[PDB]
Curated annotation (Swiss-Prot), chains A, B:
Gene source species: Severe acute respiratory syndrome coronavirus 2
Gene: rep
Outcome following mutation: residue 142 to A: Does not affect ability to cleave and inactivate human TRMT1
Taxonomic lineage of the native organism: Viruses, Riboviria, Orthornavirae, Pisuviricota, Pisoniviricetes
The protein's role, per its UniProt record: Cleaves the C-terminus of replicase polyprotein at 11 sites. Recognizes substrates containing the core sequence [ILMVF]-Q-|-[SGACN]. Cleaves and inactivates human TRMT1, preventing tRNA guanine(26)-dimethylation of tRNAs. May cleave human NLRP1 in lung epithelial cells, thereby activating the NLRP1 inflammasome pathway. May cleave human GSDMD, triggering alternative GSDME-mediated epithelial cell death upon activation of the NLRP1 inflammasome, which may enhance the release interleukins 1B, 6, 16 and 18. Also able to bind an ADP-ribose-1''-phosphate (ADRP).
Name the UniProt record assigns to this protein: 3C-like proteinase nsp5
UniProt topological domain (Cytoplasmic) ranges: 1-306
Length: 306, 306
């Protein structure tokens, strides 16, 4: 038992990180086969990013303006292409440490691991969720751009995020590995707002199930409720509406605990309406919404990868 | 900014994990140079662990009773030695993926990363602290024994923990890489209590500093206090006493924020005495004590390793 925010093992991604320099700007890139991916604003300078014309900027730029280093070793760039908000640099050496991999665009409420990197070197790894408003609550300093977020499916790495920016509220925004932002963000230094965040209801439920599984059951009450009625209370607290797809996704946890989703919902309604009363659930004094059902299933079944 | 429980990148340890089998018992071992380390109770069976005589058990045991696998590849064991609560199996192949490494016995209040493993394969990585009472609050299922805890200093891996058991309170216990338990625990299935846990005061302060650094400063009051007076309140809440060594260790954070440790202490005293009032600090509704000053320094400066 016990319950921790767990990240995937980062070994397979660590071998893919490199440093990309264009003039004085340095950030991280991702080296897969003979291609390096990084944010296109590597080609901008720190003090003129208010509203870049990326096309014009990129036009002063040749293959040789791009310094790519993997550890000590410099790579030769033989080709460059802009794709949405990402630059792709063709290099002359396939990464010998390339994992099996794909590129996926994740959905709001899914989780993934971030390998936070500086100057192309790994600093740390943590787990994050794509919020409903397509931000993440990461931990990212200057130099972190180009750090990636991923999942591991057995031996396969699914890359889903590349870091680009921090928004005024101190949350973070970025793209998929095709260069397309999650959310309405753009890669210029301008005031940009995320909308209202909402709680990922299905995640909160999974976490309530994990609680039960771990023996923490104080909050289970003696009521049940309806989807419709639950959803009336959900909406008022800025919880995402629960659908029957959510109910069915929780099926394993439901089955494993013997507690029907709508019972667990009733418990949740009371926690929403009366707060925790200074108690904790799995050591937390707030309702956690950054574990998917899938996450909970695996931390309570021991899923492995390498 | 932002503030996350961050683990070290796990790549260098992932290449060291193997599966160790003795009869029907399987757990994880750590393969460094030509030696595999694992818990000695790999030689016991699931249902007779009430009070093993490890010496007698080990005596029915020969090199060939030990099945060591690294992925598909079986390793040949040419020698075995019991050291305290660990078994050391000499193998005929040096791990080609051995990192630079040392073995350290950590102190209560230090943090480290855990690579939780099953059947010799990595499942996940998270950060943990050695509690004052020498437990950890991990996330560990059946099969997790032999998973290790570590730090990275630049390119060097310092192994500090090997997992052994879960205690009745749902916390976890284990040894250093020499086989010596942290705390008064022993490797038999018997009711065993950890004493009272205490909060790691210096960590809570570092986390208050991280809060300030991130712009979350609501809790800063207009008082100061004395070590002595602070310590009077500390003791009543089961906080570890703060010493001048602690004060001096917080020096970087102190200097970087302009807030003297004893001011921050005064703020902490009020939080202890009046609670948070339903507010949060770095998104938490409790006082976090699992980040060292060192941890905070690095998540707020971008320390890298590979
Ligand atoms: C990342 O590492 C990058 N740094 C640089 C430096 C250059 F010189 C060129 C290109 C890049 S990308 C930055 C990561 C953030 C630093 C602080 N926390 C981080 O996550 N990303 C940026 O600095 C990013 C780039 C320009 C302005 N950025 C921002 O993140 C800024 N935010 C915003 O303007 C907004 F809209 F509020 F989000 C800011 C104020 C620096 C935090 C661009 C968006 C291209
Ligand atoms: C680990 O993976 C191991 N499993 C086995 C299985 C065998 F057949 C032989 C040896 C081993 S070591 C176990 C990890 C725990 C399982 C549940 N959560 C875990 O962290 N470790 C043990 O099962 C451990 C070993 C015997 C009894 N152990 C306990 O952890 C038990 N706790 C206690 O008895 C005490 F004192 F309360 F702590 C228990 C009740 C199974 C959780 C020994 C201590 C050698």
């Amino acid at each position: 038992s016990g319950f921790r925010k767990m990240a995937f093992p980062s070994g397979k991604v660590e071998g893919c990180m490199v440093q990309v320099t264009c003039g004085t700007t340095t950030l991280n890139g991702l080296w897969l086969d003979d291609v390096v991916y990084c944010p296109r604003h590597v080609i901008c300078t720190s003090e003129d990013m208010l509203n870049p014309n990326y096309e014009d900027l990129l036009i002063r730029k040749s293959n040789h303006n791009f310094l790519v280093q993997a550890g000590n070793v410099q790579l030769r760039v033989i080709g460059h292409s802009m794709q949405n908000c990402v630059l792709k640099l063709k290099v002359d050496t396939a990464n010998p440490k390339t994992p099996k991999y794909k590129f996926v665009r994740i959905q709001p409420g899914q989780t993934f691991s971030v390998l936070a990197c500086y100057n192309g070197s790994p600093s740390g790894v943590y787990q994050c969720a794509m919020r409903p408003n397509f931000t993440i609550k990461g931990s990212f300093l200057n130099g972190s751009c180009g750090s990636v977020g991923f999942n591991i499916d057995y031996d396969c790495v699914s890359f889903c995020y590349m870091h680009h920016m921090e928004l005024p509220t101190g949350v973070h925004a970025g793209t998929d590995l095709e260069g397309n932002f999650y959310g309405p963000f753009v890669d210029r230094q301008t005031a940009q707002a995320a909308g209202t965040d909402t709680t990922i209801t299905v995640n909160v439920l999974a976490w309530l199930y994990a609680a039960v599984i771990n023996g923490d059951r104080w909050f289970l009450n003696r009521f049940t409720t309806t989807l419709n009625d639950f959803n009336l209370v959900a909406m008022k607290y800025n919880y995402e509406p629960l659908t029957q797809d959510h109910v069915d996704i929780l099926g394993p946890l439901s089955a494993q605990t013997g507690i029907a989703v709508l019972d667990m919902c009733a418990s949740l309604k009371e926690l929403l309406q009366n707060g925790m009363n200074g108690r904790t659930i799995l050591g937390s004094a707030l309702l956690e919404d950054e574990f998917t059902p899938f996450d909970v299933v695996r931390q309570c079944s021991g899923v492995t990868f390498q």
